[PDB]
């Protein structure tokens, strides 16, 4: 079943920008049907900073209906964009190719001014 293959492995997902999320799931020690999300994200979006290198991701996943929320802080050995992104959404396994639909928020500074920008990513599974 598609839900269990997701839990058993490290799966890769490409969004409409060509960016790639790789997810690993570890059962929560306290929350039933819930998994700690680990893995990495590679940003390939045009016009953006912090491209082409893996950033760790973290968050949580609910197996009962395949809903996820995960985040990236844009700091690694290669580049620091002094910002963070959070994605929240759901998996749809009903088609021949699985899709993860999400809305995201990006928190960042422009000079001394903070802002939170919104968007949507649709990720198609790499198989």
């Amino acid at each position: 079943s598609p839900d269990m293959k997701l839990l058993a492995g490290a799966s890769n997902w490409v969004n409409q920008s060509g960016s790639v999320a790789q997810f690993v799931f570890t059962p929560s020690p306290t929350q039933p049907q819930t998994y700690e999300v680990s893995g990495n994200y590679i940003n390939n979006a045009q016009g953006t900073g912090c491209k082409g290198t893996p950033y760790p991701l973290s968050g949580a996943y609910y197996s009962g209906n395949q809903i996820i929320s995960f985040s990236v802080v844009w700091s690694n050995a290669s580049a620091n964009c002094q910002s963070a992104t959070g994605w929240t959404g759901y998996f749809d396994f009903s088609g021949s190719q699985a899709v993860l639909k999400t809305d995201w928020n990006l928190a960042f500074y422009s000079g001394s001014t903070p802002a939170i920008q919104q968007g949507q990513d649709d990720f198609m599974q790499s198989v």
Partner: peptide
Amino acid sequence: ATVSESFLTE
């Protein structure tokens, strides 16, 4: 690490 003002502007 190369520091960018943000994820949007370098």
